[PDB]
Amino acid sequence: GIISLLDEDEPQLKEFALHKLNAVVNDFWAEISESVDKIEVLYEDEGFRSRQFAALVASKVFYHLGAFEESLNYALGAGDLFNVNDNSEYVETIIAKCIDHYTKQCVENADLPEGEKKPIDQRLEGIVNKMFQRCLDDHKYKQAIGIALETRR
Amino acid sequence: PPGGGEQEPPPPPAPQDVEMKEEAATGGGSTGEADGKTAAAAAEHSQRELDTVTLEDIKEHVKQLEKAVSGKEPRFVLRALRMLPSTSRRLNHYVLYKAVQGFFTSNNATRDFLLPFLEEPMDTEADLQFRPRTGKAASTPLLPEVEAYLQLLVVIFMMNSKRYKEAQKISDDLMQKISTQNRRALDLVAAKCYYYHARVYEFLDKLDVVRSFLHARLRTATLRHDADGQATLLNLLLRNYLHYSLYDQAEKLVSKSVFPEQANNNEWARYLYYTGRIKAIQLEYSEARRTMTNALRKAPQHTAVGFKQTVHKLLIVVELLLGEIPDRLQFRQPSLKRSLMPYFLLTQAVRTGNLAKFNQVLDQFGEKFQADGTYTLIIRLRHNVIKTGVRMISLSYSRISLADIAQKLQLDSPEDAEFIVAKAIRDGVIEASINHEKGYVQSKEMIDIYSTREPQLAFHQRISFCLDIHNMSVKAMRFP
Amino acid sequence: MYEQLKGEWNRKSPNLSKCGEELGRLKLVLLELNFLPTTGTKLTKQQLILARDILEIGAQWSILRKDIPSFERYMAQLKCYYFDYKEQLPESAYMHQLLGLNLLFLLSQNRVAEFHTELERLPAKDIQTNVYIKHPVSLEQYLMEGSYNKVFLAKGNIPAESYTFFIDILLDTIRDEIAGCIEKAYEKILFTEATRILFFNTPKKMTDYAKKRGWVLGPNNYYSFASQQQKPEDTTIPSTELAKQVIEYARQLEMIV
Amino acid sequence: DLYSRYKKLQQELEFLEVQEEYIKDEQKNLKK
Amino acid sequence: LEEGKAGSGLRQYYLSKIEELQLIVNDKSQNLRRLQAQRNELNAKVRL
Amino acid sequence: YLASLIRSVVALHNLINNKIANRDAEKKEG
Amino acid sequence: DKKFHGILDQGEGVLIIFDEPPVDKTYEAALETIQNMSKVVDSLYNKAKKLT
Amino acid sequence: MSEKKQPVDEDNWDDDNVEDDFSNQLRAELEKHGYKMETS
């Protein structure tokens, strides 16, 4: 019942609250489900500069209750802290949502055929060639041509 | 000595025959079954493994005894090796070591020496393919051995099993990941060992950290590979998160899903009993009575013996709070009889409205209720019986006076009777009108439910229930 | 080391300024060890036992200040202290009644669900021991009588302690039930018969009832006219929706087909 | 190369997906 | 590769998951193809 | 009422007999 | 004795005769379902025998 | 099951369902109903 600690508008209590969460979030994944409305207070707060990290804990609760595309929306505005973590499983699940959203947008862009372009976030197209640098550095040529067929561009 | 000495040699060949061919025919058979097709799974040997392990869990496990030295554990765990068809030589070497027990002086390699033995499939260089067979080699020797329960220094070997088999979990998550179909075969094996996880801790201390380790395997099975896997993990949750506080009751809302599809059969039938006791603490009776009734009728096959009987005992507990229950000896079993005797006469005092008889049952039979933890209802069941007593009278009579039903139900006073009938109307229990002067209660027959209304409206749920089974039969027909 | 901390526990506080000063001193404790997850070396949980007693009296200060969100904040903290994975802790004092303060306050707001789940800290020993817990479970028993009478007789002697604030809210949630519970449906109940439950002599509460209920104000009596009430038919309209039920029902017969 | 076949394999996937309405529409006609 | 040969397998897993899903739908078609050819042969039986 | 009564037993004819003949061929073959 | 179909009125003293309430569709339904209970129970032997 | 939690923790029997309703209510009863003869 630490949810009541979020009522205070003072920032330094929030970093100690999330410091508790992210460690035990594995066991408390069920507890974060009721923190939705009170996390948005921090995410929509202008004086709260951790909203990049607050978008991650907002993606964990929605992933717990069955929401997926909404977690991908928060992944956009989550800043560089979201795309800097390549570790374990969480990297391959987000790129499966992001690159599929990227490759279905590029096919849509080729149907314009020119002009009246849809908005393309620099973060979703930015990790394309960024993670593609891991290919040429790994020297494996077989899938180096595969990304070009994926994005179609 | 000569009589008992000559009778020692014959038995050990029996584990050298059937127990050999247990994992020789199934394991050697599941080899090609897990190399391809692999549809689903199926891999029926994993379900045949349910007909072995559970059969071995009585006799013989790996051991026994049997008047052997318990050398079957090191035998199959060494010299995997393996390679192309020479794996038969490994089974041939398993036959070669059978004479070692019968000829030379037999030595027990279990326990202390089992620590490097579980590393041998990795040390044999290499496995090289099936972790479930080595998971079986890290379980079937050790997990059926847990049934000894000596509690001294071998529990950490049961923990060492949960260690090196967590190294099999390391090979479970890292290896494959693409059309595995071994995980679905392991979902039966990973289930069991995760149950033995919970069981071994219960003898020492309930697991605080494994609760966090449970959500690990729980959440990671979604969405990548989940078939029957998260259900068994959700069973681990609702099992212990019930017996231990707190908040775990309402947790079922965000987890479900269901999780579909319910597997395997009776395995999900008991799950409705788990959440059944939960929803019983939510005080909602109607959803609790249907999930408890469905828990008995969906549960095959037993015997033996009281494992299904004891779970059925506490299952009809929700019927005590329903207010409508018959005598429960129609559910009695000669084995469950002796255990249900303090719980038997309880419901016999529920059918009656006597306080002196009901309070005497709580005093003498309250000792048996301490192990069940059912004391939550005994305070609210007094209000349940007074509703059954007034329903018995209100259904038997057109008009019922408050003064005549006062002492008959021994409410003893007119004022609290006005409070009960008021709350009875609030709960929709009674339709009786009341004429207050002294006062008295004058009711009338309730009718117009008739024919054209209730039966045809209920038949909307009956046919919608039946027409779905038409699809259930077609779906089940499409697999063959 | 550190402190002074418990020195303000015995004197409590004259006003809310010292209560905020103790909360400000508690902030330094929340900055270092916070609430969790330090196992230790369980000696690092000793100041948590010292932190409990001041959070125990903080809930006593929260009902003194009447603030609801703070009251459930001190309770939920202490709720997780005993819920913590280490169950061996030294015994405290204020732990007893504060488990009942939020228990009785939650009974005043009528929620039945969270009432019994708060006693699940020691559910088996509820009826067995802890007379402080025995009073509310016997108090809820009287609410089903209903009481009214028996509650006020048990309201004569209570330890309590601090329940005085909550039994006043327990009034209002019972007081508005005299209008709700007794009817529907009774015919006519005499003047002084309703006064027997309401006590007082001729309060303005029953006068407010004559306004609110409406219902009826009769001489030396009260009436339920007219009649008993509203005379439900209930309706001849549902014949419409019965034809609506056949729509999808005949459609389900065509789905097979 | 693995993305190559990854772009090859959904053909017969979708080719059998249109083979679903192939039979289902054919068999109901022939049924009538 | 990291894009990649670990991710592309998950990409190939989706197709193989749908391929098995399609095979399930195909297995539902295959035995249903027999119900056609059967009745189609029975449609020749009334003509026989 | 009849639509409720017929679909109940028609199911008993359809559901039972299908399960019978199915498992007789399915499991006895393999 | 079924020789007379009707009902009396004790208060106002009027004897009412009604032959109305037939039994036709109902016993022809439930009684056949009671027999259908012997179809599944007797088939339960076939079920459990082939499987295990 | 035998898996998971549960392993850790005419006849007169059929008529006994109804027969116990006789135990707590109205005995059988002969004597009392036989005493009601000369009562009124």
- Interatomic CA distance for residues B158 and B146, integer angstroms: 7
How would you label C106-137 residue by residue, b for 16+ Cβ within 10 Å and e otherwise? bbbeeeeeebbbbbbbebeebbeeeebbebbb
The residues, ordered by sequence, that sit 6+ positions from H22 with a Cβ below 8 Å of its Cβ are: H28
CB-based burial of residue A70 (10 Å sphere; 0-12 exposed, 13-18 middle, 19+ buried)?
middle
B107 neighbors B71 (Cβ within 8 angstroms): yes
Q: Which of B202, B327, B385, B396 is most worth mutating to test chain H (most H CB atoms within 10 A of its CB)?
A: B327
Q: Which amino acid is at C253?
A: L
- Interatomic CA distance for residues B288 and B249, integer angstroms: 13
How would you label A45-66 residue by residue, b for 16+ Cβ within 10 Å and e otherwise? eeeeebbebbbbbbbbbbbbbe
B198 neighbors B207 (Cβ within 8 angstroms): yes
B109 neighbors B74 (Cβ within 8 angstroms): yes
Neighbouring CB atoms inside 10 A of B385's CB total 20
Neighbouring CB atoms inside 10 A of A129's CB total 11
- Interatomic CA distance for residues B299 and B268, integer angstroms: 9
Quickly tell me which residue has 């009214």 as its tokens. C148
Classify strands C188-190 and C221-223 as parallel, antiparallel or unpaired: antiparallel
Quickly tell me which residue has 């005379």 as its tokens. C231
The residues, ordered by sequence, that sit 6+ positions from B400 with a Cβ below 8 Å of its Cβ are: B393, B394, B432, B441, B443
The dihedral built from the CA positions of residue B261, B265, B267 and B271, taken in this order, carries a sign that is positive
C104 neighbors C170 (Cβ within 8 angstroms): yes
Neighbouring CB atoms inside 10 A of B247's CB total 14
Say yes or no: C34 contacts chain A, CB-CB below 8 A: yes
Task: Cis check for the bond before C159: say yes or no (omega within 30 of 0).
Answer: no
The residues, ordered by sequence, that sit 6+ positions from E45 with a Cβ below 8 Å of its Cβ are: none
Q: Which amino acid is at B287?
A: E
C188 neighbors B436 (Cβ within 8 angstroms): yes
Q: Which amino acid is at B154?
A: V
Q: Which of B351, B357, B359 is nearest to B378 (CA)?
A: B359
Measured N-to-C along each axis, helices E7-47 and A90-109 cross at an angle, to the nearest 10 degrees, of: 70
Beta-bridge partner residues of G16: G7
Structure tokens at B32: 């090609």
Neighbouring CB atoms inside 10 A of F9's CB total 14
Structure tokens at H4: 């998971």
Structure tokens at C52: 């409990």
- Interatomic CA distance for residues C160 and C167, integer angstroms: 10
Quickly tell me which residue has 């630490």 as its tokens. A2
Beta-bridge partner residues of B440: B435
- Interatomic CA distance for residues B255 and B247, integer angstroms: 13
The dihedral built from the CA positions of residue B287, B290, B293 and B297, taken in this order, carries a sign that is negative
The residues, ordered by sequence, that sit 6+ positions from B379 with a Cβ below 8 Å of its Cβ are: C127, C137, C140, C141
- Interatomic CA distance for residues C124 and B375, integer angstroms: 7
Kindly report the backbone phi and psi dihedral angles of residue C137, in degrees, each rounded to the nearest multiple of 5, phi listed first.
Answer: -65, -30
CB H1 to CB B195 under 8 A?
no
Helices (H), B36-154: 44-56, 72-77, 87-96, 98-102, 114-123, 131-137
What long-range pairs does A123-129 form, CB within 8 A, spacing at least 24? A123/A76, A123/A83, A124/A76, A124/A98, A126/A83, A127/A83, A127/A95, A127/A98, A128/A99, A128/A102
Say yes or no: E7 contacts chain A, CB-CB below 8 A: yes
Give the closest of B177, B477, B479 to E9, CB-based. Answer: B177
Beta-bridge partner residues of C222: C189
Task: Cis check for the bond before B138: say yes or no (omega within 30 of 0).
Answer: no
Measured N-to-C along each axis, helices B229-243 and B182-204 cross at an angle, to the nearest 10 degrees, of: 10
Beta-bridge partner residues of B435: B440
Say yes or no: E12 contacts chain B, CB-CB below 8 A: yes
Q: Which of H7, H8, G47, H9 is nearest to B303 (CA)?
A: H7
Contacts A–C by Cβ distance under 8 A: 30
- Interatomic CA distance for residues B421 and B441, integer angstroms: 10
Helices (H), B351-374: 355-372
- Interatomic CA distance for residues B158 and B140, integer angstroms: 12
Structure tokens at B472: 């259930």
B379 neighbors C141 (Cβ within 8 angstroms): yes
Contacts of A145 in chain D (CB under 8 A): 3-4
The residues, ordered by sequence, that sit 6+ positions from B117 with a Cβ below 8 Å of its Cβ are: B73, B74, B77, B78, B109
Helices (H), chain C: 7-11, 16-32, 46-65, 68-83, 95-108, 113-118, 131-143, 149-154, 164-175, 177-182, 191-198, 204-212, 239-255
Do chains B and A meet with 3 or more Cβ pairs nearer than 8 Å?
yes
Angle at the Cα of E23 (from E22 to E28), degrees rounded to 5? Answer: 95
Q: Which of B336, B329, B320 is nearest to B388 (CA)?
A: B320
- Interatomic CA distance for residues C27 and C21, integer angstroms: 10
Q: Max CA-CA distance within chain A?
A: 55
Q: Which of B206, B210, B212, B246 is most worth mutating to test chain A (most A CB atoms within 10 A of its CB)?
A: B212
Q: Is C45 left (phi over 0), alpha (psi -120 to 50) or beta?
A: alpha
Do chains A and E meet with 3 or more Cβ pairs nearer than 8 Å?
yes
What CA–CA distances, in Å, run from A102 to A68, A110, E4, G28? 16, 13, 15, 66
Q: Which of B145, B146, B121, B133 is nearest to B62 (CA)?
A: B145
Kindly report the backbone phi and psi dihedral angles of residue B428, in degrees, each rounded to the nearest multiple of 5, phi listed first.
Answer: 70, 25
Give the closest of B202, B311, B327 to H17, CB-based. Answer: B327
Structure tokens at B94: 């398993």
Say yes or no: B449 contacts chain C, CB-CB below 8 A: no
- Interatomic CA distance for residues B431 and B171, integer angstroms: 66
Structure tokens at G52: 């295990």
B224 neighbors B253 (Cβ within 8 angstroms): no
- Check chain A for breaks (C–N over 2.5 Å) and list the residue before each, or none: none
- Interatomic CA distance for residues C192 and E11, integer angstroms: 81
Neighbouring CB atoms inside 10 A of B137's CB total 25
3-state secondary structure of B439: coil
Structure tokens at C13: 């506080």
Q: Which of C145, A55, E30 is nearest to D23 (CA)?
A: E30
Q: Which of B173, B163, B256 is nearest to B220 (CA)?
A: B173
- Interatomic CA distance for residues B131 and B52, integer angstroms: 19
3-state secondary structure of B355: helix
Task: Cis check for the bond before B259: say yes or no (omega within 30 of 0).
Answer: yes
Shortest distance, CA F28 to any CA of chain C (angstroms): 30
Q: Which amino acid is at D27?
A: Q
Quickly tell me which residue has 């408390």 as its tokens. A28
Give the closest of B459, B470, B480 to F11, CB-based. Answer: B470
What single DSSP character describes residue E6? T
Contacts of A27 in chain C (CB under 8 A): none
3-state secondary structure of G25: coil
The dihedral built from the CA positions of residue A105, A111, A114 and A117, taken in this order, carries a sign that is negative
Q: Which of B392, B400, B393 is nearest to B444 (CA)?
A: B400
- Interatomic CA distance for residues B77 and G17, integer angstroms: 90
E10 neighbors A92 (Cβ within 8 angstroms): yes
Beta-bridge partner residues of C190: C221
What single DSSP character describes residue B400? -
CB B220 to CB A29 under 8 A?
no
Neighbouring CB atoms inside 10 A of A79's CB total 15
